[PDB]
Design an enzyme around this catalytic site. Structure first.
Site, PDB file in Angstrom:
ATOM      1  CG  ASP A   1    -139.251  40.802  74.069  1.00 58.24           C
ATOM      2  OD1 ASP A   1    -139.308  39.465  73.798  1.00 58.24           O
ATOM      3  OD2 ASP A   1    -139.091  41.435  74.856  1.00 58.24           O
TER       4      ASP A   1
ATOM      5  N   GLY B   1    -141.915  32.481  80.407  1.00 54.83           N
ATOM      6  CA  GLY B   1    -141.675  31.853  81.063  1.00 54.83           C
ATOM      7  C   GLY B   1    -141.194  32.771  82.448  1.00 54.83           C
TER       8      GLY B   1
ATOM      9  CB  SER C   1    -142.510  42.638  73.506  1.00 49.96           C
ATOM     10  OG  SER C   1    -141.785  42.779  72.162  1.00 49.96           O
TER      11      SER C   1
ATOM     12  NE  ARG D   1    -138.944  48.795  77.876  1.00 49.41           N
ATOM     13  CZ  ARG D   1    -139.367  49.129  78.007  1.00 49.41           C
ATOM     14  NH1 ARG D   1    -140.569  49.980  78.466  1.00 49.41           N
ATOM     15  NH2 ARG D   1    -138.585  50.669  77.456  1.00 49.41           N
TER      16      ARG D   1
ATOM     17  CE  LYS E   1    -137.737  38.670  77.094  1.00 48.95           C
ATOM     18  NZ  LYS E   1    -137.171  39.537  78.259  1.00 48.95           N
TER      19      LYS E   1
END
EC number: 3.4.25.1
Lengths: 226, 229, 195, 125, 212, 222, 196, 204, 195, 196
Positions: free
Chosen positions: A17, A47, A169, A19, A33
């Site tokens: 995701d 994390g 998310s 966000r 990510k």
């Protein structure tokens, strides 16, 4: 943060995701990510946001050394063993909750790895806080040895389960497909649900609506001759 | 101060066009040690409402008696309306809610999560939520314990909101409930094979089918995980 | 903490320090210094933890003077402040905390301009036309605002300063038995026995 | 004890430094390599020659990759190239791949390795 | 936060701020630090918001049960010392309170008492209470004199809160001015501290640290 | 351990007009990172053209809806069909709030309605007691995100008249019931992308002496 | 986590579960706990999953090297390497490793290492936290040098009780057999013994 | 105290149409005491702009830390550093003191000189790249700032339209913030020309 | 801030009380009383922590007065300190300790001889020739045995009291803004502005 | 401690161990855990000695008053007194109690009561600290509705396994046979069970 990894016959598919949160405050609407140890060894992380990317970058450097040093393609195993070893020394104070995936000459792979060097192998693993949401959807449609295309539809929809019910998310769903003995194709923004609607009135302002205390001119120029 | 002693976990639930399906695991957990098995937590109250509770068995049992005594009060007087118009799920929900609220005042709480779900005598589905905090919400699918973030997301695909209920039926619901109970058994350490499935339908009432087993579980990819060596 | 005031006047800098010394709960002394002349045209006053500050001040007075005799001409007040800022940044990271809150007043004779600086123990340099540390700061930062103008003389600054002294004496629960006053200016560093 | 901490490179009396001239003799008795700069690329090129007829030469890389965009090639001695190609790769990773996470400028990289060379004419061992 | 009252010849001037923050966030700028105990007595709002405001609404109840029962208008000393024993009953119940009760009678004169959470009540002629009572004090007490005019007294109330607003973080918002007479307090309205700034920078010639 | 308080999030916004008032809020209810409900107003009509929301924790925030709606009934009974005013409503609440202060409420409470002059009146309460009138007040977990924009479009905060360049301040401009619809939607649109306790639904309740009008708008799913 | 190992007539059969819970969220449920640290000395892991895996690589490294310079290690020898690491990390890690291995000189042997680090040579061992529930069953129903079939069903049945009382134990039952015949992996699906 | 709530600070930054803008407040406090209504938290090496938020001491400490590293790059390679290359640099540098860290939030803003594109980036104390082409806001009223900047923002802004959105967004957060306000200064950064203009606002 | 002093001579009692008040971090009053008359020739001075002092002083004023007007006999200083001691002892066991140290100086009419009691905040009375409370009284004690005689007039004990106060300016880390002196004499109770 | 009770064909047999420790030191080794609270319905103490004994008197006190007014109780009733008292003193007191009785109508019955004040009927119940260890043996070796001879030796063997693995259990094995016939006390000395 909902980050899934679904293994299939021909390779492994890793999605995330876009966000990015900092607290309940959304830091970035859209920032991928997914990171890259090697071309064939991608990973993503949830994390501590700084501690996934530094860890990935550093072990990124040390496999890149190796990859020249053996004069061949690296392996998923090589990344995992250095990751796992690194994280134990600090005793899990450098947080990292990575789905590590990739294909290599020695078959399809798909691992998860936790902060203190606990490691799992599954066929479908998810980490972050949206991990639960994903996992429910992921344990129903699945069967041994998917097709390529089936695996892509199911992985996206595991993040979508995420988008719906985990507040960490949101927004765009990126996908990255890795398949054995062929190039890796990053299908960023495969599924894009929710887009911010147009303003009811566009916000423009005439000048002098913000008042200036004083004016000065400071340029970004360096000193040069007259 | 309260410490959880003997706890139970996981009830799932969803609406459909004519009624609800609420289902629960049955197993008394006592932490990692498991001391009771087949412990029922679908407590039927009336004959068209199941009150599905999770958390402490002790608190569940002490309010299990009080739930039977409301029906006893209702049957005191009103021979024309001793359950017909004196019992609906909304009354049973409120009764439970203010007891947990008053114990949160004390600081000496009833440590539970509570679903009250049924069909009203207006003929309309009911699904509300209460706990030891004593929050209250209505919902279109609902769950407790470990399934309030595992199973509940799977059911939110199925029914998105309060206008997807007539797009959902009892065969499509049945399956969704089965699937959900199977999934809970894999990823929770506190969920077992027994589960009892209760459908409250408005055309056939409380049909409570008891001791269903998980079937079509996959454990045949377990050999293709190898060692690390 | 203690009284520790700055006022940068338009021909000189004026610092002031607490006379008093209190260890445990008893005053030992009431004429003891709380500032040490660092350079011939730079003065530094200090307050804090009351044993750390004095010792460390000698550490700074030594280091800044070593470079002043090296080049046979001192270090300018910006450069001194920069040096103090650096050290204190290391020192709060260090195992042994150092708390020294210092006002460096100096007459910069290298641009012929007065400068005063407030460096807290975190280690933050700040240019200022008047400063203070501790609780004294709470009563004087406004009071100096009212009556300061950019035009100032040494004798106008004393008379405003003796106003600030008295206000602090009524209002601040601790005693300090008056200030000691020192001027730093173009003709050197002199003291005034009017308190 | 160690006492080999004196230099093995030292000045000659009538100028120059004798030790680095001797090393270059190994380059003009070496293998031959060349580089033409185009306006759209560089070609670099070299000769392979065998130690035995039963030897391979596709198991040897006389042109080696330092980073995807910067390659290197030698004349001189083999052994000396083996070790130095690794030190260059290692310094290209510690100093631009931990610090900027990209591949370094080519001007800069050449400088960094020349430091390694310079401090190898210094001290014993 | 800063609340002050000073006795002079025309009575008492109360001047307070209005920025009442939540911490690093400014909850509201509109919070009035005046608490109308009745038409003839004023209370400042310093300490915890909730507690200080609330019980001085209940003090007005005790004002109206003075009026009724005694058929007289309440002494300042009587009001103040009611609220005092009440917070002693709650002392170590953790509630916080600091108010200046201002009143002017024909049988005691103008009188301020600063009643506090601990059951402390102090008679006094000037108090300034708050986060930024120190800043406001400096301006006020230098230029303080018992002989003073209403205009000068009003302008000194504005200027003192203004100084607090400048240096301390939790002050600001808006000012509200009252001029206590024996017929009652006269309201002299709400002034924003941000318009007040730029008037006072021009007119005094002060605020010379601000770049302009 | 048992912890006697929690939260449930939500974000509310009460705007006073010049003859109307609007008390709005999202209909999303959450606990931590589970969406409890996509649909659930806390913005209850209470009678007498007063609308209340006690937003934040839901267990407390239902306690004040209860006791307040008890007071509505008992006001008519014990003051013999005398209607509860906006002013009356504010102070009553204060008393309920203040009544548990050693085991305090953990909600941010708001009422809205019109005043007796036929202009909006918004009072907003801190969690333990006192209230002060507002003209704009956000609250909830995303208060400080919607609040500084509402001040720049209602109260014209940090804006000046064009071509004066800060010599003349920018005065108030009388508002429209439509106009305020635009403000509320544009803010909670920003709110959905920049906070995570916001989405699913928005319900605006508009209150006048001419009726209470509901409007449900859907928001973004995250 | 449930781990046992039991010796029999031709060698040693090791048996473990395949669920790893942390708290109440199962990290993986098809988890392989049977780990190759030599060529005929495999271990079973319990305790904290990372810390044991950390140790077994470090052992795999020491034992591999010991093979090439000094000759094959024994079961004994392997216990001295796990023992001395757990022993210098007993205040800061806690690991329960059971070391089973097939010698060619003295058949299969079982060693247990607890959380403080000690050798105890034993004819069967039981350890973990889900198989801390079958202590009384295991002691009673043990028979000296069973046949191969009897051993497997013995270990399966035991881990079935262990699974039954512990939500931290579960999944398939994995078993590795260390023998002259080779290294043979057996698997029992959940249904095949939760039917009983 | 907190090392990150001791003198406030916010830096805003926005993108526009062929231009960027960065801006800060002027309020430097030591706890609740205001010390100065003057202090830049914005600095510049060549055509890259560093706003550094947080802790008093760490504004200076990191500023001369990057003073050293900027030098090395310019003297060797004879060019001024790019926005993107600076962002990477900052990422790695923040991470060096992992435990007990740098107590700051730097914000990187420029316009490239090799392609002429706006670039913005953000960081925490530990530091992680927070890419956008929207706006990067940091500080203590960073929360306030995130809502307010969104409400205003439109992709692509004319350099003095751009100036209207950022001035307003910054002043409004900053006059609801305890440790920040006291004046504000906005830079509109064009490819070859910067204007530094102060804003009149509440000094309270 | 905490300074109450007692010198009992051979015809009067000399009490002094602080004029300063500090609540919070600032001085609120520089001119105040911390002493209240109970009876015509019984004075009770009080100090300790904020607000225990205010409320429990007037509580005692009331009790003692209720008795002495009703039965028209003014209690011995002996009877009075005993009553104050009974409430002081009680309260340590109970929910609220009352944090207050009292010098009850009164002139016995039933012995025509002054009496000065010291009651510590626990509730233990002890008669003395002279007395103090707080850490400030620690300074003053060592003057008191030196210069006191068993033949002292009011005049002697006022001149002794000047040395003790002047000792306090030097040695106490805080001010007290002078003291109110009240002299509890056989004729009444008089206030003098001597320090 | 280890206690247990098990239903069988002709009644229920309650079993216990009369070791009662304080710390390392065994306080007394002949303190019974088999408590008569009704003449045909007995109970089994475990947990802290004090807390259970004290409650057992209260519960006995109200079944004296019950039997004298309402006539003989059932096993259900004895247990329900206990349940509801341990609920109102559960953040205060701790108990393990197995309540088992012979009624004519329903034969032998076993209820068990954790410390939260839950009651649960089971065919076999185990409690104490050694209950965990012998849990695997109990469900493996129990038969549903077996004769008296098989029940005596089952509880003997189960409690021999408890004492082997729990050192807070020992002293002797006592048993109460509650049957249609009546109350027949047993004790088995250490030399008898050690073998078996």
């Amino acid at each position: 943060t909902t980050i899934v990894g679904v293994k299939f016959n021909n390779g492994v598919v890793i999605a995330a995701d876009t966000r990015s949160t900092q607290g309940p405050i959304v830091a970035d609407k859209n920032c991928a990510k997914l990171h890259r140890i090697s071309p064939k060894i991608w990973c993503a992380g949830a994390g501590t946001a700084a501690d996934t990317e530094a860890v990935t970058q550093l072990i990124g450097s040390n496999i890149e050394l190796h990859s020249l040093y053996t004069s061949r393609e690296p392996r998923v195993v090589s990344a995992l063993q250095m990751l796992k070893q690194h994280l134990f020394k600090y005793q899990g104070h450098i947080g990292a909750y990575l789905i590590v995936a990739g294909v290599d000459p020695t078959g399809s792979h798909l691992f998860s790895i936790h902060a203190h060097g606990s490691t799992d192998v599954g066929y479908y693993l998810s980490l972050g806080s949206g991990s639960l949401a994903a996992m429910a959807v992921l344990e129903s449609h699945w069967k041994q040895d998917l097709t390529k295309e089936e695996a892509i539809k199911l992985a996206s929809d595991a993040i979508q389960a995420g988008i719906w019910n985990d507040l960490g998310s949101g927004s765009n769903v990126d996908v990255c497909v890795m398949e054995i003995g062929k190039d890796a194709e990053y299908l960023r923004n495969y599924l894009t649900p929710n887009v911010r609607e147009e303003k009811q009135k566009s916000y423009k302002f005439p000048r002098g609506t913000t008042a200036v205390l004083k004016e000065s001119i400071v340029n970004i120029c360096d000193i040069q001759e007259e | 101060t309260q410490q959880p002693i003997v706890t139970g976990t996981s009830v799932i639930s969803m609406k459909y066009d004519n009624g609800v399906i609420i289902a629960a695991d049955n197993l008394g957990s006592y932490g990692s040690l498991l001391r009771f098995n087949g412990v029922e937590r679908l407590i039927p109250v009336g004959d068209n409402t199941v009150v599905g509770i999770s958390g402490d068995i002790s608190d569940m049992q002490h309010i299990e008696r009080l739930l039977k005594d409301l029906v006893t009060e209702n049957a005191y007087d009103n021979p024309l309306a001793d359950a017909e118009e004196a019992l609906e799920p909304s009354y049973i929900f409120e009764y439970l809610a203010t007891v947990m609220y008053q114990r949160r005042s004390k600081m000496n709480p009833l440590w539970n999560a509570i679903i009250v779900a049924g069909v009203q005598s207006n003929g309309d589905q009911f699904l509300r939520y209460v706990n030891l905090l004593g929050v209250t919400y209505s919902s279109p699918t609902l769950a407790t314990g470990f399934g309030a973030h595992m199973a509940n997301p799977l059911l939110r695909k199925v029914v998105d909101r309060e206008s997807d209920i007539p797009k959902t039926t009892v065969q499509v619901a049945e399956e969704a409930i089965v699937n959900a109970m199977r999934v809970l058994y894999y990823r929770d350490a506190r969920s077992s094979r027994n589960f009892s499935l209760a459908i409250i339908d408005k055309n056939t009432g409380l049909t409570f089918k008891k001791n269903l087993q998980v079937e079509n579980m996959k454990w045949d990819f377990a050999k293709d995980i190898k060692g690390y060596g | 903490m203690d009284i520790i005031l700055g006022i940068r006047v338009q021909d000189s800098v004026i610092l002031a320090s607490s006379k008093a010394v209190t260890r445990g709960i008893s005053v030992l002394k009431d004429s003891d210094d709380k500032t040490r002349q660092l350079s011939p045209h730079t003065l530094m006053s200090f307050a804090g933890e009351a044993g750390d500050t004095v010792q460390f001040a000698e550490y700074i007075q030594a280091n800044i003077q070593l470079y002043s005799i090296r080049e046979d001409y001192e270090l300018s007040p910006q450069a001194v402040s920069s040096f103090v800022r650096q050290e204190l940044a290391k020192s709060i990271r260090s195992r042994r905390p150092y708390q020294v809150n210092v006002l460096i007043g100096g007459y910069d004779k290298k641009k012929n301009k007065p400068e005063l600086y407030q460096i807290d123990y975190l280690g933050t340099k700040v240019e200022l036309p008047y400063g203070a540390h501790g609780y004294s700061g709470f009563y004087t930062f406004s009071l100096l605002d009212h009556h300061y103008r950019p035009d100032m003389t040494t004798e106008e600054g004393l008379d405003l300063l003796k106003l600030c002294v008295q206000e602090l004496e009524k209002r601040m629960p601790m005693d300090f038995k008056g200030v000691i006053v020192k001027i730093v200016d173009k003709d050197g560093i002199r003291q005034v026995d009017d308190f | 004890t160690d006492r080999y901490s004196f230099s093995l490179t030292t000045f000659s009396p009538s100028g120059k430094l004798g030790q680095i001239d001797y090393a270059l003799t190994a380059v003009k008795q070496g293998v031959t390599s060349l580089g033409i700069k185009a306006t759209n690329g560089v070609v670099i090129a070299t000769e392979k020659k065998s130690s035995s007829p039963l030897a391979m030469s596709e198991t040897l890389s006389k042109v080696s990759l330092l980073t995807p965009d910067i390659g290197a090639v030698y004349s001189g001695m083999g052994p000396d190239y083996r070790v130095l190609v690794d030190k260059s790769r290692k310094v290209a990773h510690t100093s631009y791949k931990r610090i900027y996470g990209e591949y370094p400028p080519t001007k800069l990289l050449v400088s960094e390795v020349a430091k390694i060379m310079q401090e190898a004419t210094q001290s014993g061992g | 936060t800063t609340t002050l009252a000073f006795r002079f010849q025309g009575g008492i001037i109360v001047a307070v701020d209005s920025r009442a923050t939540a911490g690093n966030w400014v909850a509201s700028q509109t919070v009035k630090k005046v608490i109308e105990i009745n038409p003839f007595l004023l209370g400042t709002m310093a300490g915890g918001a909730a507690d200080c405001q609330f019980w001085e609404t209940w003090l007005g109840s005790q004002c109206r049960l003075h009026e009724l029962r005694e058929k007289e208008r309440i002494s300042v000393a009587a009001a103040s010392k009611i609220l005092s024993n009440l917070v002693y009953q709650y002392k170590g119940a953790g509630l916080s309170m600091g108010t200046m009760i201002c009143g002017y009678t024909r049988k005691e004169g103008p009188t301020i008492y600063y009643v506090d959470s601990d059951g402390t009540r102090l008679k006094g002629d000037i108090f300034c209470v708050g986060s930024g009572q120190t800043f406001a004090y400096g301006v006020l007490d230098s230029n303080y004199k018992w002989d003073l005019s209403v205009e000068d007294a009003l302008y000194l109330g504005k200027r003192s809160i203004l100084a607090a607003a400048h240096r301390d973080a939790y002050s600001g918002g808006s000012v509200n001015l009252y001029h206590v007479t024996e017929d009652g307090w006269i309201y002299h309205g709400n002034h924003d501290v941000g318009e007040l700034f730029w008037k006072v920078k021009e007119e005094e010639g002060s605020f010379n640290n601000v770049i302009g | 351990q048992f912890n006697p308080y929690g939260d449930n999030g939500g974000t509310i916004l009460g705007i006073a007009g010049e003859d109307f008032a609007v008390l709005a809020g999202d209909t999303r209810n959450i606990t931590d990172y589970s969406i409890n409900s996509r649909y659930e107003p806390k913005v209850f009509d209470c009678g007498d053209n007063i609308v209340m929301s006690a937003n934040g924790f839901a267990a407390d925030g239902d306690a004040l809806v209860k006791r307040f709606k008890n007071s509505v009934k008992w006001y008519h009974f014990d003051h013999n069909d005398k209607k509860l005013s906006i002013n009356s409503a504010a102070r009553n609440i204060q008393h309920l709030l203040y009544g548990k202060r050693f085991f305090p409420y953990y909600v941010h409470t708001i009422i809205a309605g019109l005043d007796e002059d036929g202009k909006g009146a918004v009072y907003s309460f801190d969690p333990v007691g006192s209230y002060e009138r507002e003209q704009c007040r956000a609250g909830g977990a995303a208060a400080s995100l919607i609040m500084p924009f509402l001040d720049n479009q209602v109260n014209f905060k940090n804006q000046y008249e064009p071509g004066t360049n800060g010599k003349v301040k920018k005065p108030l401009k009388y508002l429209s019931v439509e106009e305020v619809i635009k403000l509320v939607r544009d803010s909670f649109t920003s709110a959905t992308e920049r906070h995570i306790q916001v989405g699913d639904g928005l319900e605006i309740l508009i209150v006048t002496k001419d009726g209470v009008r509901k409007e449900f708008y859907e928001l973004k799913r995250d | 986590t449930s781990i046992m190992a039991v010796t029999f007539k031709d060698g040693v059969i090791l048996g473990a579960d395949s669920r790893t819970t942390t708290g109440a969220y199962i990290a993986n449920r098809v988890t392989d706990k049977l780990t190759r640290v030599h060529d005929k000395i495999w271990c079973c892991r319990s305790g904290s999953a990372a810390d044991t895996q950390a140790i077994a690589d470090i052992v795999q490294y020491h034992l591999e090297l010991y093979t090439s310079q000094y000759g094959t290690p024994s079961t004994e020898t392997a216990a001295s390497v796990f023992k001395e690491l757990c022993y210098e990390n007993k205040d800061n890690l806690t690991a329960g490793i059971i070391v089973a291995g097939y010698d060619d000189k003295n058949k299969g042997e079982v060693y247990t290492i607890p959380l403080g680090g000690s050798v105890h040579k034993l004819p069967y061992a039981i350890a973990g936290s889900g198989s801390t529930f079958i202590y009384g069953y295991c002691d009673k129903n043990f028979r000296e040098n069973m046949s191969k079939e009897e051993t497997v069903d013995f270990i399966k049945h035991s881990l079935s009780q262990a699974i039954k009382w512990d939500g931290s134990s579960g999944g398939v039952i994995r078993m590795v057999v260390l023998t002259a015949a080779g290294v043979e992996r057996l698997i029992f699906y959940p249904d095949e013994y939760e039917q009983l | 105290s907190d090392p990150s709530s001791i003198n406030g600070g916010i830096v805003v930054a926005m993108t526009g149409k062929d231009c960027v803008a960065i801006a800060c407040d002027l309020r430097l406090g030591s706890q609740s005491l205001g010390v100065s209504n003057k202090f830049e938290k914005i600095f510049h090496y060549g055509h890259v702009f560093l706003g550094i938020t947080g802790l008093a001491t760490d504004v200076t400490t990191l500023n001369e830390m990057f003073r050293y590293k900027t030098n090395l790059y310019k003297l060797k390679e004879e060019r001024a550093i790019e926005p993107e290359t600076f962002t990477q640099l900052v990422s790695s540098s923040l991470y060096e003191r992992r435990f007990g860290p740098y107590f700051v939030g730097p914000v990187v803003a420029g316009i490239n000189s090799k392609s002429g594109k706006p670039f913005i980036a953000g960081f925490d104390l530990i530091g992680c790249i927070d890419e956008a082409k929207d706006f990067i806001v940091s500080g203590t009223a960073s929360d306030q700032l995130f809502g307010m900047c969104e409400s205003l923002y439109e992709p692509n802004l004319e350099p003095e339209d751009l100036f209207e959105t950022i001035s307003q967004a910054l002043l409004n957060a900053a006059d609801r913030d305890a440790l920040s306000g006291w004046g504000a200064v906005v830079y509109i950064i064009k490819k070859d020309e910067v204007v530094k203009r102060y804003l009149k606002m509440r000094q309270d």
